[PDB]
C-alpha cells in the first residue's frame, strides 16, 4: 500500500493537440490555457487520464481473455464501468456516505476501478496536467485548405462521364453563388458583431436575436443548394498544438497503490506505449509522445522518498528500470482474484 508518484517528461514526437469546449471560442481553436488568455497552454490531465483509462481497460480485456470470435465476457455495462465509471444499469453498488472501507472489497476485486475510481468511489490514480517546458513550444498547426480535386489536377477529370462533369459544373456554380450570398449575410452579421460593443442589455438582446436570425438565414441559404450542402473548397482553421519535440512536465500519483493496482497501471502504460497517442487530430498523426517517468514512493513519516524505478516509453520500446516495477507488474499479472465482472 504505497503512494507512487510518477514524475517525468512527455517529449512530443508529433504535435500534441486537444479541443476542449471551454477553451475554444469563435476566435478560433485555442489550447487549454494555464489560467488566462496570455498563459502557457497545457495538455489537460483529463485527456491523458482518459487515454490511460482506455489503455487499462484494454489491458483488462486482453487479460480476461477473448472468446473464440473475439468477444470479451464483459457486457456493455461492465465496459462502461471500467472505461468511464458510468453505470448504465444502475446496479453499481452506490456507497452511502459514512460506510467504513467504502469499496475495499470492490477495490480488491476490481483493480481498474480502484485505480481510476467511480461515482462515490475515489480513484487512487490522479493524472495531472502536462505543462510545457520553456516559452513557445506551441503553435497553430493543421491549417491549409480543402481543395477541389479536379481544379488542382485535370488528370482526375478523365475518369468522369459527361453527366458527372456537368454535375461538378453545377456544384461549383452553386458553391460560388452560395459563397457570395453567405458572404454578404456574414458582412451584415459582422456589422452586428461590431455593434455588440454598445451593449445596452436590451439592444444587446435584440442585436443577438438579429444575429440568430441571420444565422438561420445562412443555414437556409445553404439548405437550398441542391448539389453540395457544404462548400468543398474552404480554408481549414488551424488548431493550436504543442510543437514536435516539446517537453511537457507531467506528474501522476497513485495514492495507496497496492502492488496489484500499481502493476495494472504500469501494464496500462505499457499498452499505451504501443499507440502512445494523446489528444486528437490523429489524422495528422497528432498525439504521438515518448514519455519518461521516474516512479518514487514515499513511506509516510519519512523525510525523503525512494525511487522505485523508471518507466521510459519511446518508439523503440518500453524500458523499465528498478526491480520494484517488475515485481509490481508480475504481481498484477499473477493474481487471479480480480472479479472485474459487475457484482
Amino acid at each position: 500500500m504505497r503512494t507512487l508518484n510518477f514524475n517525468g517528461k512527455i517529449s512530443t514526437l508529433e504535435p500534441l493537440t486537444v479541443t476542449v469546449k471551454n477553451a475554444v471560442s469563435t476566435s478560433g481553436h485555442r489550447l487549454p490555457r494555464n489560467g488566462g488568455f496570455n498563459a502557457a497552454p497545457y495538455f489537460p490531465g483529463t485527456s491523458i487520464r482518459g487515454t490511460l483509462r482506455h489503455a487499462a481497460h484494454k489491458v483488462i480485456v486482453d487479460r480476461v481473455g477473448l472468446n473464440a470470435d473475439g468477444k470479451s465476457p464483459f457486457d456493455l455495462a461492465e465496459h462502461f464501468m471500467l472505461a468511464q465509471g458510468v453505470d448504465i444499469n444502475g446496479e453499481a453498488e452506490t456507497f452511502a456516505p459514512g460506510e467504513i472501507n467504502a469499496g475495499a472489497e470492490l477495490r480488491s476485486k476490481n483493480p481498474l476501478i480502484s485505480l481510476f475510481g467511480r461515482w462515490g468511489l475515489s480513484g487512487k490514480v490522479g493524472i495531472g496536467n502536462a505543462i510545457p517546458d520553456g516559452d513557445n513550444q506551441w503553435g497553430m498547426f493543421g491549417g491549409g485548405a480543402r481543395s477541389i480535386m479536379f481544379q488542382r489536377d485535370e488528370s482526375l477529370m478523365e475518369f468522369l462521364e459527361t453527366d458527372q462533369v456537368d454535375r461538378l459544373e453545377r456544384l461549383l456554380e452553386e458553391q460560388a453563388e452560395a459563397s457570395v450570398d453567405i458572404s454578404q449575410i456574414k458582412t451584415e452579421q459582422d456589422a452586428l458583431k461590431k455593434a455588440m460593443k454598445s451593449a445596452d442589455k436590451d439592444t444587446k438582446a435584440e442585436l443577438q436575436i438579429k444575429v440568430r436570425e441571420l444565422d438561420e438565414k445562412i443555414q437556409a441559404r445553404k439548405d437550398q443548394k441542391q448539389e453540395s450542402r457544404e462548400s468543398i473548397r474552404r480554408p481549414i482553421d488551424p488548431y493550436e498544438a504543442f510543437i514536435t519535440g516539446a517537453e511537457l512536465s507531467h506528474r501522476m500519483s497513485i495514492k495507496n497503490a497496492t502492488d496489484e493496482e500499481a502493476g495494472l497501471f504500469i501494464s496500462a502504460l505499457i499498452r499505451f506505449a504501443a499507440e502512445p497517442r494523446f489528444g486528437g487530430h490523429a489524422n495528422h498523426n497528432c498525439g504521438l509522445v515518448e514519455a519518461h517517468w521516474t516512479v518514487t514512493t514515499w513511506k509516510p513519516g519519512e523525510l525523503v522518498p525512494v525511487t522505485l524505478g523508471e518507466i521510459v516509453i519511446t518508439p523503440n520500446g518500453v524500458e523499465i528500470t528498478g526491480d520494484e516495477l517488475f515485481a509490481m507488474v508480475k504481481a498484477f499479472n499473477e493474481n487471479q482474484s480480480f472479479d472485474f465482472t459487475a457484482r
Binding site: N7, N34, A39, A40, I131, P132, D133, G134, D135, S249, R251
Partner: protein, 520 residues
C-alpha cells in the same frame, strides 16, 4: 581600484609627454617623477595641480603587470580603514589571499550594497572572449575557422550592443549557435592535445551553461570586447562564502529596502546571495525623522500610457506631449531623470527649446562633464539611467535643482531567456516549478530592482536637511493614494516613510473620475 595611479614607466613616459606641451612646469614633473603616490589624492590637495594631471597616459596599460600593484597593495595593507572601489573584495575572491592577505583580522563594510548586488548580477558572468580564445590559441590556430569566430564576434556586438549583458532571445540562441559553430572549429585544431584542451574548454563552457542558470552575450566593460556570457553559480555561492569569510561583514546602502519593514524587504538580498538564517544578524531600516521637504505630484490613472506598443519601444505621442508640457511648466532648475537614453533623445527633440537651457546625457557620455557644466549654468538636466546615483550638487554644496522629474518609472524589460534559463536551472537541479512560475519570479525580482532604482532616483532629490524637492512622477502606473489595490502598489515604497503623508495628499495631474456614490 588600481590601474589609475603612478605606473613608474608611464611616469618616465610622462617626462617626454610633458616636455612637448607642459615644458613650463617640467620641474613639478620631476617632483611627481620621484614620489610614486596615488594620483587621486595628489591633484585635490596640491592647490589644484592642473598642469600634468590628464589621466589618459598616467594610467596602466593593458598589460601593465609592473609589480607596483603589489607595492601599493602592500602599502595600503596597513590602514585605519580603506576607502576604495568594490573590486578587491571580489577580485581576491578566489585569488586565495594573493592580494589582500589576512581576512579574519579584517572587517567588511559594503557601502551601497544595493548596487553591489545589482552589478553582482552582472559579475555572475565569465567572459568567453573570442579574441582571448583567438589570442590564447595562436599556435594551434585553425585560421580558416577564424572567420566563424569573426562572424560570431560581429553577432555578439549586434545583440549585446552597448550592454555588458543583454537578455534578448538572440543572446541565448547566439550563445548556443556560437558554441555549436565553435564545435565546428573544434574538429580543426591540428594538435590532438590542443584539440582536446579546446574540446574540454568548450565542454566545460557547454555544461556550465546548459546544466544550470543563464546564458547571454557580453561586451566587456573595458576595451569594449565582445564576449559570450554565462552564469557562474559557483561564484554565486562563493560570494556568500567569501562575505561570511570576513570576521563580521556589514552590507549597508541607502536604497537596500524594497519596503520599510526589514523582515520582508530584505529577502531579495538574502535569496540573491543565497544567504540563509545563519548570517542575518540585523535587518534594520534607519531613516531621518526630518530631512528636507518633499512635495509630490504623481500622474494619475488617466495620464496616457507611456508605451503605445512597448515591443518596439514607441512612446505614445499623448504621453510625450504631456510630459513635455509639464516639464515646460516648470519654473526653476530641474533634474529630469529618465530611464533610457532614447527617452532623453525623444524628450529633447520634442521639447521646443524652452528657456533655462536643457542638458542631455548622450549615450555613453560620462556624467562628470555634463554635471559640472550644468553646475555653472543651471537649468533642465535631462539625465537617464546613466545618472548612476551620485548627486547634482551645487558647487558650494547647495541644492541647485528644485524639481526632480521622473518621466516614467524605470521598468526593466522582460527577460524571456533569464526566465527560461533559470527554469532550466531549477529543472535540472530537480526543483519542480513551471516556466510561468519562473517568469513570475523573474518579474518580481525585476520589479524589486525597479523599486530600488527609483528609490535611488528619489534619493537624488534630497541630500541636505535644508533641501526642498518637488518630485514629479509622470508615470501613469505609479499607484494613486486612493488605489490601495493597484497592481504596482510596491512602488509606493519608493517614497520614504517620513514623507508618506504628502504622498497621500499629493496633487494629481491626470486623476481618474471619482463620484459621491450614495452607497458609501
Amino acid at each position: 581600484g588600481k590601474a589609475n595611479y603612478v605606473s613608474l614607466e608611464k611616469v618616465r613616459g610622462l617626462l617626454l609627454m610633458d616636455e612637448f606641451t607642459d615644458l613650463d612646469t617640467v620641474k613639478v614633473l620631476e617632483k611627481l617623477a620621484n614620489w610614486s603616490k596615488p594620483l587621486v589624492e595628489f591633484e585635490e590637495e596640491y592647490g589644484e595641480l592642473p598642469a600634468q594631471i590628464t589621466p589618459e597616459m598616467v594610467t596602466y596599460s593593458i598589460w601593465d603587470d609592473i609589480q607596483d600593484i603589489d607595492d601599493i597593495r602592500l602599502n595600503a595593507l596597513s590602514a585605519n580603514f580603506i576607502v576604495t572601489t568594490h573590486a578587491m573584495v571580489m577580485v581576491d575572491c578566489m585569488c586565495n589571499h594573493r592580494i589582500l592577505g589576512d581576512k579574519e583580522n579584517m572587517y567588511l563594510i559594503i557601502d551601497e550594497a544595493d548596487i553591489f548586488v545589482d552589478m553582482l548580477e552582472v559579475w555572475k558572468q565569465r567572459r568567453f572572449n573570442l579574441r582571448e580564445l583567438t589570442s590564447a590559441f595562436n599556435e594551434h590556430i585553425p585560421r580558416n575557422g577564424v572567420h566563424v569566430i569573426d562572424q560570431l564576434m560581429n553577432d555578439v556586438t549586434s545583440i549585446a550592443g552597448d550592454l555588458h549583458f543583454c537578455s534578448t532571445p538572440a543572446a541565448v540562441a547566439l550563445f548556443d549557435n556560437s558554441f555549436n559553430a565553435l564545435s565546428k572549429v573544434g574538429r580543426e585544431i591540428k594538435n590532438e592535445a590542443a584539440r582536446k584542451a579546446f574540446f574540454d574548454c568548450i565542454y566545460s563552457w557547454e555544461m556550465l551553461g546548459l546544466s544550470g542558470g543563464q546564458k547571454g552575450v557580453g561586451v566587456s566593460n573595458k576595451r569594449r570586447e565582445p564576449a559570450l556570457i554565462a552564469v557562474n553559480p559557483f561564484i554565486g555561492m562563493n560570494v556568500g562564502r567569501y562575505c561570511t569569510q570576513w570576521r563580521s561583514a556589514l552590507l549597508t546602502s541607502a536604497t537596500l529596502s524594497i519596503t520599510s519593514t526589514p523582515e520582508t524587504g530584505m529577502e531579495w538580498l538574502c535569496k540573491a546571495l543565497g544567504l540563509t538564517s545563519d548570517t542575518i544578524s540585523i535587518r534594520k531600516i534607519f531613516s531621518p525623522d526630518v530631512y528636507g521637504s518633499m512635495k509630490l505630484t504623481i500622474a494619475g490613472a488617466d495620464f496616457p500610457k507611456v508605451f503605445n506598443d512597448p515591443k518596439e519601444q514607441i512612446f505614445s505621442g499623448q504621453w510625450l506631449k504631456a510630459v513635455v508640457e509639464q516639464l515646460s511648466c516648470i519654473q526653476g532648475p530641474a533634474l529630469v531623470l529618465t530611464a533610457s537614453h532614447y527617452e532623453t533623445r525623444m524628450i529633447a527633440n520634442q521639447l521646443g527649446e524652452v528657456s533655462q537651457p536643457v542638458y542631455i546625457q548622450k549615450a555613453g557620455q560620462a556624467l562628470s562633464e555634463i554635471i559640472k557644466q550644468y553646475q555653472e549654468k543651471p537649468g533642465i538636466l535631462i539625465s537617464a539611467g546613466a545618472s548612476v546615483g551620485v548627486s547634482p550638487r551645487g558647487e558650494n554644496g547647495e541644492q541647485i535643482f528644485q524639481d526632480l522629474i521622473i518621466t516614467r518609472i524605470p521598468f526593466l524589460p522582460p527577460d524571456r531567456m533569464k526566465a527560461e534559463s533559470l527554469y532550466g536551472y531549477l529543472k535540472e537541479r530537480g526543483y519542480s516549478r513551471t516556466f510561468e512560475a519562473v517568469n513570475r519570479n523573474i518579474y518580481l525580482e525585476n520589479l524589486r530592482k525597479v523599486i530600488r532604482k527609483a528609490k535611488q532616483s528619489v534619493g537624488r532629490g534630497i541630500r541636505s536637511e535644508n533641501d526642498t524637492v518637488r518630485i514629479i512622477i509622470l508615470d501613469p502606473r505609479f499607484p494613486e493614494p486612493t488605489d490601495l489595490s493597484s497592481k504596482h502598489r510596491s512602488l509606493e515604497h519608493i517614497i520614504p516613510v517620513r514623507f508618506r503623508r504628502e504622498y497621500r495628499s499629493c496633487e494629481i495631474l491626470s486623476p481618474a473620475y471619482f463620484e459621491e456614490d450614495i452607497q458609501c
